[PDB]
Write a protein that binds this DNA or RNA. Structure first.
Lengths: 158, 106, 129, 203
RNA sequence: GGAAAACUUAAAAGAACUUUGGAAAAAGAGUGAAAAGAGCUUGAAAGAGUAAUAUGUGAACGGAUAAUUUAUAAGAAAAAU
RNA sequence: AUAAACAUACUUUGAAUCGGCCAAGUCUGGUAAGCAGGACUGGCGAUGCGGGAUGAACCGAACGUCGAGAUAAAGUGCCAAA
RNA sequence: AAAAUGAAGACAUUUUAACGAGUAAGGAAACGAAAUGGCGUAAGGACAACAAAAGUAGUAAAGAUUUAAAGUAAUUUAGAU
């Protein structure tokens, strides 16, 4: 699986990726949407609070039946949850990407989450035994995750 | 500097109850309350001058114009028919149109 | 010298209901339905191809430059329109290589024949050259 | 000889067929695009075939109102008609209105009833030569670049002749001051006030 | 009673060593003409994700006419006696 | 009298169709029916356009793509051109 | 429809006049003044650089995605990846 975008300056960016991750796409797509653009130092602190249920992940698009919370004030969204499994999976990729920046030799404090995308993977089917001799499907929803962290420096365009 | 035009109101195109012909635009010249005061204006120039908020780096003019001529009366209440180079934008209904004094036959 | 080419309808005649369904393509098909809105020429939807839209015979199939089209595959194809260079224009076929395209373009300049693919399949001489 | 459709061109040492002539016997011809002859020049005293018929209200010495163009709203004095172009030759005497000697088509003016008359205007010059002499022309196409400065120098060199022909204004200026309130009337812009309906105004 | 399932490359040369990780893997490095990377010739539509741009009071979409923005896109000749 | 030469007379081969519906200075059964059934014509079906707010049949008028002008039914306080 | 011209031009000739709504249905091919005109898919037989190297193709085929042009339309053409 290839990356959606390529960095403008490869020498100042680092990448991490996961393929066929056993985590719900609908939940992870919202978690990655929350931390897009925030600094790596800040992002790791947001994801830990989602684990201990102190910061919300607004479910902007997949909000069917999702209950309202008190931490969803100001985000223009009335619904949010605390997906722990999806937050942990991102936390392992952010650490992997950061260790790539250290190998390259970039300054950690200047890295932001410039690009992060989630794609739908191939599902695995199972059996659910129903009334009157019917069998249905019990399908996982895995996903691919890409992450590109770039050093943030001031730009000028005259 | 001076006022060399008479304001006319772009009421709307030549139309019927359920149709519309944007080739001809109807105008209400100020002070013309009857069709017998129309023969003076038949043939005078008419301009729809509008303003466009252009960006600093664009060389397009900030004041553009569409010109046209008054061709015939329309009804007994001093309403005229004007045909322009390009049909007037329907967003300009109720705006003012400069009715000049040339081609002068005085 | 070049006449005024007048097109009676510059838009596209799109198939009915093609804007609502992705299975119905936009290539025109006359609706034969017994209750069809378009084939009964209802107000609002009465736009069907007719012979009346045909452009003038004099200025038909004429490119905007004022000439016609004459596809060429080699240099010898150009020799068929050297007496009519004021009437035709060479149009190199899409499969002709870049090596052969230079020979056609070089010869067509000799014979004073316009080529409409003069900047086709050109080399990478756009940056750093 | 050569076919009427055959216009030989030089081959840049490229591959040419056996029937095509070589470079040594090909002499290139300049592309010719101008096929229509320009206008003829006739005697300065005779009128052009393309002469408009002026309105009966427009007579020499009458005062006209310019209702279009750069000098819109100004008042001028009509001396005579340019026979070679059909445009009126007016002067809103420069000491009064600042309108110089110029040419204006009769469709952009209104003939007022006020008339300055004035004979002996001394129009010995001020013909189609004079107006073509003081016109500011562009910098052609192939004349190097000559950006910006070309027009600034043109006004300086043509300024002297412009003043020289303002000896015409010496007569109307004196007469205009004879009529009370006329000098104020001439120097002031023409305006359409409240209740000034053009179909009711009369001049 | 009774199916489905064809294709890497010319050649496996099928990455092989380091860092992060419990591991799978990822980032480098390398092979190859080209990753074509084994879910391997090309890679469409339906469905998503990212980026750019635009719009908004109980449907949406289409047509005619203009305005705005963007794009395409027409020339090197040359006057009178 | 009027009209009629892309007039007139056809010949051969064959398609589809024979559930029909409407109007009326018309009729029969019925208390009557947007009911049932007929005589003559015109329509809808197979037909859009302008008008009757909306309407298969009513009124004007039947359609190649367009520009300008007089018009038809019918309209002219605003929606809506007058 | 009628006149005129006619071995090859070309736009299926030139001129004049009338005409052009439509369900079911019909108008097979060919027919120089053509007894309707055409577009598209695949396969077979020929034609395709006329001076002895004769359609395009690793100086990039088919396919795919788009940008523009031609055609009333069916569709065709070319650029970029």
């Amino acid at each position: 699986v290839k990356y959606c975008a390529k960095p403008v300056n490869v020498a100042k960016a680092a990448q991490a990726r996961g393929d066929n991750l056993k985590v719900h796409f609908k939940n992870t797509y919202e978690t990655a949407d929350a931390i897009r653009g925030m600094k790596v130092a800040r992002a790791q602190e947001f994801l830990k609070n989602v684990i201990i249920k102190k910061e919300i992940v607004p479910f902007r698009k997949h909000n069917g039946g999702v209950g309202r919370k008190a931490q969803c004030k100001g985000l223009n969204c009335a619904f949010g949850r605390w997906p722990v499994k999806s937050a942990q999976f991102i936390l392992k990729l952010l650490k992997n990407a950061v260790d790539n920046a250290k190998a390259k030799g970039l300054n950690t404090a200047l890295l932001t989450v410039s690009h992060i995308a989630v794609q739908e993977a191939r599902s695995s089917r199972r059996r659910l035994y129903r009334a009157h001799g019917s069998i249905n499907s019990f399908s996982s929803s895995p996903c691919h995750i890409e992450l590109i962290l770039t050093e943030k420096e001031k730009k000028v365009a005259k | 500097k001076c006022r060399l035009h008479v304001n006319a109101v772009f009421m709307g195109f030549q139309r019927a109850q359920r149709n519309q012909y944007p080739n001809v635009a109807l105008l209400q010249i100020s002070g013309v309350n009857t069709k017998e005061d129309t023969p003076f204006y038949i043939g005078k120039r008419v301009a729809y001058v509008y303003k466009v908020n252009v960006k600093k780096g664009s060389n397009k003019p900030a004041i553009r114009a569409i010109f046209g001529k008054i061709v015939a009366p329309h009804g007994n209440h001093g309403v005229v028919k004007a045909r322009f180079l390009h049909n007037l934008p329907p967003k300009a209904m109720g705006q003012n149109l400069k009715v000049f004094l040339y081609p002068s036959n005085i | 010298i070049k006449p005024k080419i007048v097109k009676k309808y510059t838009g596209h005649f799109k198939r009915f209901d093609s804007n609502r369904f992705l299975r119905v393509k936009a290539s025109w098909r006359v609706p034969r339905g017994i209750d069809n809105r378009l084939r009964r020429k209802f107000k609002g939807t009465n736009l069907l191809p007719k012979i009346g839209y045909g452009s003038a015979k004099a200025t038909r199939n004429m490119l905007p430059c004022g000439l016609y089209k004459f596809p060429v595959r080699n240099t010898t194809d150009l020799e068929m329109i050297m007496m009519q260079n004021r009437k035709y224009a060479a149009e190199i076929s899409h499969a002709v290589s870049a090596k052969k395209r230079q020979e056609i373009i070089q010869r067509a300049k000799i014979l004073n024949i316009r080529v409409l693919n003069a900047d086709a399949r050109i080399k990478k001489q756009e940056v750093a050259q | 000889s050569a076919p009427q459709w055959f216009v030989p061109v030089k081959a840049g040492d490229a591959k040419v067929p056996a029937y095509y002539p070589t470079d040594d016997m090909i002499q290139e011809q300049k592309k010719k695009l101008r096929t229509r002859k320009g206008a003829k020049i006739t005697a300065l005293d005779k009128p052009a075939w393309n002469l408009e018929k002026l309105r009966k209200s427009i007579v020499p010495g009458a005062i006209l109102i310019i209702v279009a163009g750069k000098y819109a709203g100004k008042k001028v004095v009509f001396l005579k008609q340019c026979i070679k172009s059909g445009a009126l030759i007016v002067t809103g005497p420069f000491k009064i209105n600042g309108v110089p000697l110029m040419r204006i088509n009769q469709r952009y003016v209104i003939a007022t009833s006020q008339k300055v008359d004035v004979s002996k205007v001394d129009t010995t010059g001020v013909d189609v030569k004079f107006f073509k002499k003081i016109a500011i022309k562009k910098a052609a196409f192939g004349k190097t670049v000559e950006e910006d400065f070309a027009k600034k120098q043109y006004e300086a060199k043509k300024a002297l002749i412009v003043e020289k022909q303002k000896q015409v204004d010496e007569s109307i200026v004196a007469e205009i001051k004879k009529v009370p309130y006329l000098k104020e009337y001439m120097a002031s812009y023409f305006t359409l006030k409240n209740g000034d309906h053009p179909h009711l105004l009369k001049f």
